[PDB]
Amino acid sequence: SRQPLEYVKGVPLIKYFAEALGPLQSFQARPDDLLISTYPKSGTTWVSQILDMIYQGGDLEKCHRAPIFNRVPFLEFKAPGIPSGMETLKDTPAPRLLKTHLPLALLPQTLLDQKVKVVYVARNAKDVAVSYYHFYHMAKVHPDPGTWDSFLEKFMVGEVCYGSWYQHVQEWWELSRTHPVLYLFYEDMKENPKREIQKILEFVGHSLPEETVDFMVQHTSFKEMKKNPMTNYTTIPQEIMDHSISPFMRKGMAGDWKTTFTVAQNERFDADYAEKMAGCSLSFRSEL
Ligand SMILES: Nc1ncnc2c1ncn2[C@@H]1O[C@H](COP(=O)(O)O)[C@@H](OP(=O)(O)O)[C@H]1O
Ligand SMILES: O=[N+]([O-])c1ccc(O)cc1
């Protein structure tokens, strides 16, 4: 187990995900599809539960029909002893919610041609790094992360699954110039969920009562999503995700990275960050 990363068109991927690209090549997008796109650990599950609730008219019992990773087919997903994304996509009724972490260089062209609405979620790089480090441990398909300091170095050169975080957030940010993309921030959602949920509702064209919006706010909170077995990823085989080493719903906080980053690491990171994000109108908040 724990295979090394396999590169494809310049993007380092989990071997299985790489294999999954093959059958994924036949995927055909519907005009009414909606794509959830994120760099790993940026709130994919969060916004997935929000969107599903919306899609179910706020009905909490419909959202319980199956695990979040079944309700929302993970495009490039593949792992032993469990249906692949595409396999799940076959039993997924429209309108469909889709998930991916694929950079534009690997994104199925059909999605751009069909002008599929996109809800992109971005999170500050430091929290992404920490969250992603613990995820490497608990998601057994990933390679050995090693020490934090070592993983951090990888993360900075984009030598982790799905490549550079700096490229990812920037390329999709630029795409929203010519493609219908709702660009959201994990920090914003954490700050005022109801506000970001209203945004999403508008973007998807739907409309729900004030009372229902508050209802979704409650059940999209870290607390409820941590309790909820249809979103906390606890129903996935232990060989793919072992929560004993670190739970999927880990902390759910913005700014928690301060308890992991050493002062030296922070300074080295802030300097590098400055270069890479030089000439970019993106503005991230490392804390609330
Ligand atoms: N409802 C929620 N509110 C805030 N954060 C949430 C959340 N649900 C999940 N998260 C956090 O989102 C991150 C995972 O995102 P993703 O779905 O893209 O993999 C994890 O962060 P942490 O590891 O900092 O706790 C997880 O705890
Ligand atoms: O390895 N995994 O099981 C994963 C990896 C990434 C992700 O967004 C969800 C699950």
Side-chain angles (χ1 to χ4, degrees), residues 189-217:
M189 300 179 64
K190 229 292 182 292
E191 186 184 43
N192 187 346
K194 180 165 186 172
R195 176 193 51 189
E196 301 308 317
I197 290 185
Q198 316 201 245
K199 284 192 189 171
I200 296 170
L201 285 173
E202 177 200 351
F203 184 63
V204 302
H206 274 66
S207 176
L208 290 172
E210 202 72 11
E211 187 197 342
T212 307
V213 180
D214 294 340
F215 183 75
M216 290 181 296
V217 179

PDB file of all heavy atoms in Angstrom, residues 189-217:
ATOM      1  N   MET A 189     -17.109  31.496   4.393  1.00  0.00           N
ATOM      2  CA  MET A 189     -18.172  30.587   4.821  1.00  0.00           C
ATOM      3  C   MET A 189     -18.142  30.411   6.335  1.00  0.00           C
ATOM      4  O   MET A 189     -19.182  30.378   6.989  1.00  0.00           O
ATOM      5  CB  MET A 189     -18.025  29.225   4.136  1.00  0.00           C
ATOM      6  CG  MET A 189     -18.091  29.284   2.614  1.00  0.00           C
ATOM      7  SD  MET A 189     -17.875  27.672   1.826  1.00  0.00           S
ATOM      8  CE  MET A 189     -19.322  26.799   2.421  1.00  0.00           C
ATOM      9  N   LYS A 190     -16.939  30.303   6.887  1.00  0.00           N
ATOM     10  CA  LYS A 190     -16.767  30.121   8.322  1.00  0.00           C
ATOM     11  C   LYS A 190     -17.224  31.379   9.046  1.00  0.00           C
ATOM     12  O   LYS A 190     -17.842  31.312  10.109  1.00  0.00           O
ATOM     13  CB  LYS A 190     -15.300  29.821   8.647  1.00  0.00           C
ATOM     14  CG  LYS A 190     -15.093  28.620   9.565  1.00  0.00           C
ATOM     15  CD  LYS A 190     -15.610  28.883  10.969  1.00  0.00           C
ATOM     16  CE  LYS A 190     -15.363  27.693  11.886  1.00  0.00           C
ATOM     17  NZ  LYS A 190     -16.182  26.505  11.515  1.00  0.00           N
ATOM     18  N   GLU A 191     -16.923  32.528   8.449  1.00  0.00           N
ATOM     19  CA  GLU A 191     -17.274  33.822   9.025  1.00  0.00           C
ATOM     20  C   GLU A 191     -18.787  33.994   9.108  1.00  0.00           C
ATOM     21  O   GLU A 191     -19.336  34.245  10.180  1.00  0.00           O
ATOM     22  CB  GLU A 191     -16.670  34.954   8.188  1.00  0.00           C
ATOM     23  CG  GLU A 191     -16.854  36.344   8.785  1.00  0.00           C
ATOM     24  CD  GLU A 191     -16.330  37.446   7.877  1.00  0.00           C
ATOM     25  OE1 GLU A 191     -16.567  37.378   6.651  1.00  0.00           O
ATOM     26  OE2 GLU A 191     -15.685  38.388   8.389  1.00  0.00           O
ATOM     27  N   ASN A 192     -19.452  33.861   7.965  1.00  0.00           N
ATOM     28  CA  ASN A 192     -20.898  34.046   7.885  1.00  0.00           C
ATOM     29  C   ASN A 192     -21.531  33.064   6.902  1.00  0.00           C
ATOM     30  O   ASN A 192     -21.801  33.417   5.755  1.00  0.00           O
ATOM     31  CB  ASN A 192     -21.220  35.481   7.463  1.00  0.00           C
ATOM     32  CG  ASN A 192     -22.705  35.789   7.519  1.00  0.00           C
ATOM     33  OD1 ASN A 192     -23.539  34.887   7.612  1.00  0.00           O
ATOM     34  ND2 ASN A 192     -23.043  37.071   7.461  1.00  0.00           N
ATOM     35  N   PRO A 193     -21.774  31.825   7.352  1.00  0.00           N
ATOM     36  CA  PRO A 193     -22.301  30.777   6.482  1.00  0.00           C
ATOM     37  C   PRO A 193     -23.575  31.192   5.749  1.00  0.00           C
ATOM     38  O   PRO A 193     -23.681  31.003   4.538  1.00  0.00           O
ATOM     39  CB  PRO A 193     -22.581  29.613   7.445  1.00  0.00           C
ATOM     40  CG  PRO A 193     -22.512  30.192   8.819  1.00  0.00           C
ATOM     41  CD  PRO A 193     -21.584  31.352   8.733  1.00  0.00           C
ATOM     42  N   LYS A 194     -24.530  31.755   6.482  1.00  0.00           N
ATOM     43  CA  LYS A 194     -25.810  32.146   5.900  1.00  0.00           C
ATOM     44  C   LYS A 194     -25.608  33.056   4.697  1.00  0.00           C
ATOM     45  O   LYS A 194     -26.325  32.954   3.702  1.00  0.00           O
ATOM     46  CB  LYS A 194     -26.683  32.849   6.941  1.00  0.00           C
ATOM     47  CG  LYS A 194     -28.044  33.284   6.415  1.00  0.00           C
ATOM     48  CD  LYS A 194     -28.996  33.632   7.550  1.00  0.00           C
ATOM     49  CE  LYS A 194     -30.397  33.921   7.032  1.00  0.00           C
ATOM     50  NZ  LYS A 194     -31.386  34.080   8.136  1.00  0.00           N
ATOM     51  N   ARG A 195     -24.628  33.948   4.792  1.00  0.00           N
ATOM     52  CA  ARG A 195     -24.339  34.882   3.710  1.00  0.00           C
ATOM     53  C   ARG A 195     -23.850  34.145   2.464  1.00  0.00           C
ATOM     54  O   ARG A 195     -24.299  34.426   1.353  1.00  0.00           O
ATOM     55  CB  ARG A 195     -23.296  35.907   4.155  1.00  0.00           C
ATOM     56  CG  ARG A 195     -22.851  36.862   3.057  1.00  0.00           C
ATOM     57  CD  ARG A 195     -21.604  37.626   3.472  1.00  0.00           C
ATOM     58  NE  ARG A 195     -20.553  36.726   3.945  1.00  0.00           N
ATOM     59  CZ  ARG A 195     -19.424  37.129   4.520  1.00  0.00           C
ATOM     60  NH1 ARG A 195     -19.191  38.422   4.699  1.00  0.00           N
ATOM     61  NH2 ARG A 195     -18.529  36.236   4.918  1.00  0.00           N
ATOM     62  N   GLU A 196     -22.934  33.201   2.655  1.00  0.00           N
ATOM     63  CA  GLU A 196     -22.385  32.432   1.538  1.00  0.00           C
ATOM     64  C   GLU A 196     -23.417  31.458   0.972  1.00  0.00           C
ATOM     65  O   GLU A 196     -23.415  31.163  -0.224  1.00  0.00           O
ATOM     66  CB  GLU A 196     -21.126  31.674   1.964  1.00  0.00           C
ATOM     67  CG  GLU A 196     -20.014  32.568   2.487  1.00  0.00           C
ATOM     68  CD  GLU A 196     -19.680  33.708   1.545  1.00  0.00           C
ATOM     69  OE1 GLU A 196     -19.597  33.474   0.321  1.00  0.00           O
ATOM     70  OE2 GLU A 196     -19.493  34.842   2.031  1.00  0.00           O
ATOM     71  N   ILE A 197     -24.294  30.955   1.833  1.00  0.00           N
ATOM     72  CA  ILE A 197     -25.359  30.067   1.387  1.00  0.00           C
ATOM     73  C   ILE A 197     -26.326  30.822   0.479  1.00  0.00           C
ATOM     74  O   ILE A 197     -26.783  30.289  -0.532  1.00  0.00           O
ATOM     75  CB  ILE A 197     -26.126  29.455   2.571  1.00  0.00           C
ATOM     76  CG1 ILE A 197     -25.240  28.450   3.307  1.00  0.00           C
ATOM     77  CG2 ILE A 197     -27.389  28.772   2.086  1.00  0.00           C
ATOM     78  CD1 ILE A 197     -25.951  27.703   4.416  1.00  0.00           C
ATOM     79  N   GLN A 198     -26.628  32.066   0.836  1.00  0.00           N
ATOM     80  CA  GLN A 198     -27.492  32.908   0.007  1.00  0.00           C
ATOM     81  C   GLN A 198     -26.854  33.104  -1.364  1.00  0.00           C
ATOM     82  O   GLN A 198     -27.527  33.014  -2.392  1.00  0.00           O
ATOM     83  CB  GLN A 198     -27.738  34.263   0.672  1.00  0.00           C
ATOM     84  CG  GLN A 198     -28.048  34.175   2.159  1.00  0.00           C
ATOM     85  CD  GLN A 198     -28.776  35.399   2.682  1.00  0.00           C
ATOM     86  OE1 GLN A 198     -28.252  36.140   3.513  1.00  0.00           O
ATOM     87  NE2 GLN A 198     -29.990  35.617   2.193  1.00  0.00           N
ATOM     88  N   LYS A 199     -25.553  33.372  -1.372  1.00  0.00           N
ATOM     89  CA  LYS A 199     -24.798  33.462  -2.616  1.00  0.00           C
ATOM     90  C   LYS A 199     -25.051  32.228  -3.474  1.00  0.00           C
ATOM     91  O   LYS A 199     -25.425  32.336  -4.642  1.00  0.00           O
ATOM     92  CB  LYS A 199     -23.300  33.567  -2.337  1.00  0.00           C
ATOM     93  CG  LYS A 199     -22.822  34.925  -1.860  1.00  0.00           C
ATOM     94  CD  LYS A 199     -21.301  34.982  -1.896  1.00  0.00           C
ATOM     95  CE  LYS A 199     -20.756  36.229  -1.234  1.00  0.00           C
ATOM     96  NZ  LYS A 199     -19.274  36.162  -1.100  1.00  0.00           N
ATOM     97  N   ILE A 200     -24.841  31.055  -2.882  1.00  0.00           N
ATOM     98  CA  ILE A 200     -24.986  29.795  -3.606  1.00  0.00           C
ATOM     99  C   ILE A 200     -26.395  29.646  -4.175  1.00  0.00           C
ATOM    100  O   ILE A 200     -26.566  29.301  -5.344  1.00  0.00           O
ATOM    101  CB  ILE A 200     -24.665  28.586  -2.706  1.00  0.00           C
ATOM    102  CG1 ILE A 200     -23.196  28.621  -2.278  1.00  0.00           C
ATOM    103  CG2 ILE A 200     -24.972  27.285  -3.434  1.00  0.00           C
ATOM    104  CD1 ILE A 200     -22.846  27.613  -1.200  1.00  0.00           C
ATOM    105  N   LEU A 201     -27.399  29.905  -3.344  1.00  0.00           N
ATOM    106  CA  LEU A 201     -28.790  29.848  -3.787  1.00  0.00           C
ATOM    107  C   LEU A 201     -28.992  30.704  -5.035  1.00  0.00           C
ATOM    108  O   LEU A 201     -29.532  30.236  -6.037  1.00  0.00           O
ATOM    109  CB  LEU A 201     -29.734  30.313  -2.676  1.00  0.00           C
ATOM    110  CG  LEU A 201     -29.954  29.311  -1.540  1.00  0.00           C
ATOM    111  CD1 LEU A 201     -30.770  29.936  -0.424  1.00  0.00           C
ATOM    112  CD2 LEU A 201     -30.627  28.052  -2.061  1.00  0.00           C
ATOM    113  N   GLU A 202     -28.551  31.956  -4.968  1.00  0.00           N
ATOM    114  CA  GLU A 202     -28.647  32.864  -6.106  1.00  0.00           C
ATOM    115  C   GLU A 202     -27.995  32.241  -7.333  1.00  0.00           C
ATOM    116  O   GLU A 202     -28.609  32.135  -8.394  1.00  0.00           O
ATOM    117  CB  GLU A 202     -27.965  34.198  -5.792  1.00  0.00           C
ATOM    118  CG  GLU A 202     -27.956  35.180  -6.961  1.00  0.00           C
ATOM    119  CD  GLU A 202     -26.903  36.267  -6.818  1.00  0.00           C
ATOM    120  OE1 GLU A 202     -26.290  36.372  -5.735  1.00  0.00           O
ATOM    121  OE2 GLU A 202     -26.684  37.015  -7.794  1.00  0.00           O
ATOM    122  N   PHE A 203     -26.745  31.826  -7.175  1.00  0.00           N
ATOM    123  CA  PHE A 203     -25.973  31.268  -8.281  1.00  0.00           C
ATOM    124  C   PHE A 203     -26.672  30.080  -8.948  1.00  0.00           C
ATOM    125  O   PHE A 203     -26.614  29.933 -10.171  1.00  0.00           O
ATOM    126  CB  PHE A 203     -24.585  30.848  -7.792  1.00  0.00           C
ATOM    127  CG  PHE A 203     -23.685  30.345  -8.882  1.00  0.00           C
ATOM    128  CD1 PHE A 203     -23.297  31.180  -9.918  1.00  0.00           C
ATOM    129  CD2 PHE A 203     -23.217  29.044  -8.866  1.00  0.00           C
ATOM    130  CE1 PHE A 203     -22.465  30.721 -10.920  1.00  0.00           C
ATOM    131  CE2 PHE A 203     -22.383  28.582  -9.863  1.00  0.00           C
ATOM    132  CZ  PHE A 203     -22.007  29.419 -10.892  1.00  0.00           C
ATOM    133  N   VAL A 204     -27.325  29.234  -8.154  1.00  0.00           N
ATOM    134  CA  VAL A 204     -28.009  28.061  -8.701  1.00  0.00           C
ATOM    135  C   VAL A 204     -29.432  28.401  -9.136  1.00  0.00           C
ATOM    136  O   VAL A 204     -30.140  27.555  -9.685  1.00  0.00           O
ATOM    137  CB  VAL A 204     -28.054  26.887  -7.698  1.00  0.00           C
ATOM    138  CG1 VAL A 204     -26.643  26.489  -7.282  1.00  0.00           C
ATOM    139  CG2 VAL A 204     -28.897  27.246  -6.484  1.00  0.00           C
ATOM    140  N   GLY A 205     -29.845  29.638  -8.883  1.00  0.00           N
ATOM    141  CA  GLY A 205     -31.147  30.128  -9.334  1.00  0.00           C
ATOM    142  C   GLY A 205     -32.317  29.751  -8.440  1.00  0.00           C
ATOM    143  O   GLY A 205     -33.425  30.253  -8.618  1.00  0.00           O
ATOM    144  N   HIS A 206     -32.076  28.865  -7.480  1.00  0.00           N
ATOM    145  CA  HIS A 206     -33.128  28.414  -6.574  1.00  0.00           C
ATOM    146  C   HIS A 206     -33.525  29.502  -5.580  1.00  0.00           C
ATOM    147  O   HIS A 206     -32.863  30.535  -5.469  1.00  0.00           O
ATOM    148  CB  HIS A 206     -32.680  27.164  -5.811  1.00  0.00           C
ATOM    149  CG  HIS A 206     -32.943  25.882  -6.540  1.00  0.00           C
ATOM    150  ND1 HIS A 206     -32.312  25.554  -7.720  1.00  0.00           N
ATOM    151  CD2 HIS A 206     -33.761  24.844  -6.248  1.00  0.00           C
ATOM    152  CE1 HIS A 206     -32.733  24.372  -8.128  1.00  0.00           C
ATOM    153  NE2 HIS A 206     -33.613  23.918  -7.253  1.00  0.00           N
ATOM    154  N   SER A 207     -34.613  29.253  -4.859  1.00  0.00           N
ATOM    155  CA  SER A 207     -35.091  30.168  -3.827  1.00  0.00           C
ATOM    156  C   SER A 207     -35.747  29.388  -2.692  1.00  0.00           C
ATOM    157  O   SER A 207     -36.608  28.539  -2.927  1.00  0.00           O
ATOM    158  CB  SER A 207     -36.092  31.166  -4.414  1.00  0.00           C
ATOM    159  OG  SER A 207     -36.623  32.003  -3.400  1.00  0.00           O
ATOM    160  N   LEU A 208     -35.335  29.679  -1.464  1.00  0.00           N
ATOM    161  CA  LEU A 208     -35.870  28.991  -0.295  1.00  0.00           C
ATOM    162  C   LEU A 208     -36.244  29.978   0.807  1.00  0.00           C
ATOM    163  O   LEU A 208     -35.658  31.057   0.906  1.00  0.00           O
ATOM    164  CB  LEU A 208     -34.855  27.978   0.240  1.00  0.00           C
ATOM    165  CG  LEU A 208     -34.623  26.740  -0.629  1.00  0.00           C
ATOM    166  CD1 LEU A 208     -33.466  25.915  -0.082  1.00  0.00           C
ATOM    167  CD2 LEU A 208     -35.888  25.901  -0.719  1.00  0.00           C
ATOM    168  N   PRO A 209     -37.221  29.603   1.645  1.00  0.00           N
ATOM    169  CA  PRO A 209     -37.681  30.451   2.738  1.00  0.00           C
ATOM    170  C   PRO A 209     -36.566  30.771   3.726  1.00  0.00           C
ATOM    171  O   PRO A 209     -35.606  30.008   3.849  1.00  0.00           O
ATOM    172  CB  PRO A 209     -38.764  29.602   3.416  1.00  0.00           C
ATOM    173  CG  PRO A 209     -39.172  28.599   2.394  1.00  0.00           C
ATOM    174  CD  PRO A 209     -37.943  28.321   1.598  1.00  0.00           C
ATOM    175  N   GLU A 210     -36.701  31.891   4.424  1.00  0.00           N
ATOM    176  CA  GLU A 210     -35.702  32.316   5.396  1.00  0.00           C
ATOM    177  C   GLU A 210     -35.490  31.234   6.450  1.00  0.00           C
ATOM    178  O   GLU A 210     -34.358  30.938   6.834  1.00  0.00           O
ATOM    179  CB  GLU A 210     -36.141  33.616   6.071  1.00  0.00           C
ATOM    180  CG  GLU A 210     -34.998  34.414   6.677  1.00  0.00           C
ATOM    181  CD  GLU A 210     -34.121  35.063   5.624  1.00  0.00           C
ATOM    182  OE1 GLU A 210     -34.520  35.074   4.440  1.00  0.00           O
ATOM    183  OE2 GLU A 210     -33.034  35.566   5.979  1.00  0.00           O
ATOM    184  N   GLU A 211     -36.589  30.648   6.914  1.00  0.00           N
ATOM    185  CA  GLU A 211     -36.532  29.626   7.953  1.00  0.00           C
ATOM    186  C   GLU A 211     -35.698  28.430   7.502  1.00  0.00           C
ATOM    187  O   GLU A 211     -34.914  27.882   8.277  1.00  0.00           O
ATOM    188  CB  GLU A 211     -37.940  29.158   8.330  1.00  0.00           C
ATOM    189  CG  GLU A 211     -37.972  28.218   9.534  1.00  0.00           C
ATOM    190  CD  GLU A 211     -39.276  27.447   9.651  1.00  0.00           C
ATOM    191  OE1 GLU A 211     -40.278  27.860   9.030  1.00  0.00           O
ATOM    192  OE2 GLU A 211     -39.297  26.420  10.366  1.00  0.00           O
ATOM    193  N   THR A 212     -35.869  28.031   6.247  1.00  0.00           N
ATOM    194  CA  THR A 212     -35.155  26.879   5.706  1.00  0.00           C
ATOM    195  C   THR A 212     -33.656  27.158   5.601  1.00  0.00           C
ATOM    196  O   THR A 212     -32.832  26.280   5.862  1.00  0.00           O
ATOM    197  CB  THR A 212     -35.691  26.486   4.318  1.00  0.00           C
ATOM    198  OG1 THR A 212     -37.113  26.310   4.380  1.00  0.00           O
ATOM    199  CG2 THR A 212     -35.039  25.193   3.839  1.00  0.00           C
ATOM    200  N   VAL A 213     -33.310  28.383   5.221  1.00  0.00           N
ATOM    201  CA  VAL A 213     -31.909  28.781   5.106  1.00  0.00           C
ATOM    202  C   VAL A 213     -31.193  28.634   6.449  1.00  0.00           C
ATOM    203  O   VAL A 213     -30.067  28.138   6.513  1.00  0.00           O
ATOM    204  CB  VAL A 213     -31.772  30.235   4.623  1.00  0.00           C
ATOM    205  CG1 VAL A 213     -30.305  30.620   4.523  1.00  0.00           C
ATOM    206  CG2 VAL A 213     -32.468  30.418   3.285  1.00  0.00           C
ATOM    207  N   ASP A 214     -31.856  29.071   7.515  1.00  0.00           N
ATOM    208  CA  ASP A 214     -31.317  28.939   8.865  1.00  0.00           C
ATOM    209  C   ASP A 214     -31.159  27.467   9.224  1.00  0.00           C
ATOM    210  O   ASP A 214     -30.230  27.081   9.934  1.00  0.00           O
ATOM    211  CB  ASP A 214     -32.238  29.627   9.877  1.00  0.00           C
ATOM    212  CG  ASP A 214     -32.293  31.133   9.693  1.00  0.00           C
ATOM    213  OD1 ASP A 214     -31.376  31.693   9.058  1.00  0.00           O
ATOM    214  OD2 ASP A 214     -33.253  31.760  10.188  1.00  0.00           O
ATOM    215  N   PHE A 215     -32.079  26.650   8.724  1.00  0.00           N
ATOM    216  CA  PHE A 215     -32.072  25.215   8.988  1.00  0.00           C
ATOM    217  C   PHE A 215     -30.832  24.564   8.378  1.00  0.00           C
ATOM    218  O   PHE A 215     -30.164  23.752   9.023  1.00  0.00           O
ATOM    219  CB  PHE A 215     -33.341  24.573   8.425  1.00  0.00           C
ATOM    220  CG  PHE A 215     -33.457  23.101   8.701  1.00  0.00           C
ATOM    221  CD1 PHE A 215     -33.802  22.644   9.962  1.00  0.00           C
ATOM    222  CD2 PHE A 215     -33.236  22.174   7.696  1.00  0.00           C
ATOM    223  CE1 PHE A 215     -33.916  21.286  10.217  1.00  0.00           C
ATOM    224  CE2 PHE A 215     -33.348  20.817   7.945  1.00  0.00           C
ATOM    225  CZ  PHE A 215     -33.687  20.375   9.208  1.00  0.00           C
ATOM    226  N   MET A 216     -30.533  24.928   7.136  1.00  0.00           N
ATOM    227  CA  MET A 216     -29.350  24.416   6.447  1.00  0.00           C
ATOM    228  C   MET A 216     -28.069  24.915   7.111  1.00  0.00           C
ATOM    229  O   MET A 216     -27.070  24.198   7.166  1.00  0.00           O
ATOM    230  CB  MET A 216     -29.360  24.838   4.977  1.00  0.00           C
ATOM    231  CG  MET A 216     -30.423  24.146   4.143  1.00  0.00           C
ATOM    232  SD  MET A 216     -30.381  24.658   2.415  1.00  0.00           S
ATOM    233  CE  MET A 216     -30.794  26.395   2.564  1.00  0.00           C
ATOM    234  N   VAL A 217     -28.100  26.146   7.610  1.00  0.00           N
ATOM    235  CA  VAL A 217     -26.943  26.713   8.288  1.00  0.00           C
ATOM    236  C   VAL A 217     -26.564  25.830   9.472  1.00  0.00           C
ATOM    237  O   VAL A 217     -25.387  25.542   9.695  1.00  0.00           O
ATOM    238  CB  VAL A 217     -27.215  28.143   8.791  1.00  0.00           C
ATOM    239  CG1 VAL A 217     -25.992  28.690   9.514  1.00  0.00           C
ATOM    240  CG2 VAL A 217     -27.605  29.050   7.635  1.00  0.00           C
TER     241      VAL A 217
END
